[PDB]
């Protein structure tokens, strides 16, 4: 949790960088699967709120070890034209600590009918009457969009950074870099 | 006087093939016959256009051949004979200059890296790009270039590669034929979507004939993108040889026109006023005479 990484993408003529973000979440993602571990931490450190923003760098913060085997995973192959990056460097000592979270959302009633079939077994009329659409959520959050290979749509992952603390707390991390409880340095 | 002539339609050189799709496995690619090609599908999410691998293949197969013409420096349909006479003679002395030394490098680059692969390639650990000569029906000489050693953005050099870059030149001087059938090899991963040029079901993929394909023009776009004589900054690499620098993504356009490094104002420094411009500029003028235009004033 010492030590940061910063990943800035290289601009390039051909893609706007939210897909170049898009693309190295997924792979961070599969780097995250296939070695372990949820001491690893993810930021953005020019996210902008005004427009919701994601940027264009991004923030790991893990260990030493943990980012030394981060590296020598062939995670990063293909991906070094897009983006550079320096050292896993220590983080700054006074630096306040936020947490980093995934906000899902209820955006289609109709699969949340259609769970309703598969746990009370309603008609669709009564689906229609107890649900209407208007429960659609809209978040206003900056986002990556992804698909997976296990399930093949493809979904848009909602990333919100915390209120600036004063201190860090021990908590996890998921596989995409988002906390379940954990915190990372500001700065 | 010596002015430009009211028409001036420059055909296109490195004239690229329909560039196809298709789905395999790695470690089959040497038994890279009979693969099955993707295919466009309409799915309902309304209903959009995707197309991907299949589960049993994480390798694509993107096929198009590349002719070499040469004459790049004559118009098809010039106004004036005398500012046609003056820029084959500027052309044919850039000729004697350099006979077609970088441009045909830096090309035989995009041949090498799979940049007509445009997203088929962020998401792939293993990018590998095959080059047939085809002359009278069989292969003259074969390539077998890697695009993750060959980078995107710097401007290296290779044996086989510089075979290329002769094979390249000679095309682009005239002094032969070259016919190149260029198959990418990326590993995009089991099943994932791949992105096909797209056509305008609210979206829908391009195909041709029961099997998707990329469009021919966005091969030649990827195969321009040589020009790294623009005034860069932020650390951008190469962008399109195209007229006033101009890409997309950025929307911006480098080679500014109140800078004088556009490609016309080039021209009418190199040829009209004999004000020879630099090393860089001259092969970005050539680069876009290769590329083609219907250049000329009104």
């Not at chain 2, 021209?267 to 005479?289: F, G, K, S």
């Amino acid at each position: 949790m010492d030590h940061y990484l910063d990943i800035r993408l290289r601009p390039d003529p051909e893609f706007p960088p939210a897909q170049l973000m898009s693309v190295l979440f997924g792979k961070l993602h599969q780097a995250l699967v296939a070695q372990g571990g949820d001491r690893i931490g993810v930021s953005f450190p020019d996210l902008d709120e005004s427009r919701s923003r994601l940027g264009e760098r991004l923030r790991i913060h893990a260990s030493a070890d943990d980012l030394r085997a981060l590296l020598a995973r062939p995670w990063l192959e293909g991906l070094r034209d897009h983006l550079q990056f320096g050292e896993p460097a220590v983080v700054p000592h006074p630096t306040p600590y936020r947490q980093v979270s995934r906000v899902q959302a209820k955006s289609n009633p109709e699969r949340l009918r259609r769970r309703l079939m598969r746990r009370h077994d309603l008609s669709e009329e009564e689906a229609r009457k107890r649900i209407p659409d208007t429960v659609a959520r809209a978040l206003d959050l900056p986002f990556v969009t992804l698909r997976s290979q296990s399930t093949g749509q493809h979904f848009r992952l909602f990333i919100r950074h915390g209120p600036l603390q004063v201190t860090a707390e021990e908590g996890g991390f998921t596989c995409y870099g988002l906390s379940k409880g954990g915190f990372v340095p500001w700065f | 006087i010596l002015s430009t002539a009211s028409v001036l339609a420059f055909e296109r050189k490195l004239d690229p093939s329909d560039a196809l799709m298709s789905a395999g496995a790695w470690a089959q690619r040497d038994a890279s016959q009979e693969w099955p090609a993707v295919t466009v599908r309409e799915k309902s999410v309304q209903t959009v256009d995707v197309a991907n691998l299949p589960s049993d293949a994480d390798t694509l197969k993107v096929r198009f051949t590349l002719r070499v013409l040469g004459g790049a420096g004559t118009p098809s349909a010039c106004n004036d004979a005398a500012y046609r006479d003056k820029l084959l003679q500027t052309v044919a002395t850039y000729v004697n200059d350099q006979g077609f030394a970088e441009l045909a490098r830096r090309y035989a680059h995009n041949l090498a890296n799979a940049r007509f692969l445009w997203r088929n390639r962020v998401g792939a650990e293993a990018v590998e790009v095959r080059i047939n000569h085809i002359r009278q029906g069989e292969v003259a000489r074969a390539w077998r270039f890697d695009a993750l050693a060959i980078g995107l953005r710097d401007f290296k050099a290779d044996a086989e590669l510089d075979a290329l870059a002769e094979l390249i030149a000679s095309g682009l001087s005239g002094s032969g034929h070259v016919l190149l059938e260029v198959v990418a090899f990326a590993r995009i991963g089991d099943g994932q979507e791949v992105f096909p040029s797209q056509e305008l079901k609210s979206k829908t993929l391009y195909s041709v004939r029961d099997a998707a394909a990329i469009h021919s023009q966005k091969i030649g776009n990827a195969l321009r993108t040589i020009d790294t004589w623009y005034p860069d900054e932020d650390g951008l690499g190469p962008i399109a040889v195209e007229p006033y620098g101009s890409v997309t993504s950025q929307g911006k356009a480098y080679r500014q026109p109140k800078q004088k490094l556009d490609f016309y104002t080039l021209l009418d420094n190199w040829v009209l006023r004999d004000e020879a411009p630099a090393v860089e500029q001259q092969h970005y003028v050539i680069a876009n005479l290769i590329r083609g235009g219907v250049f000329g004033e009104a």
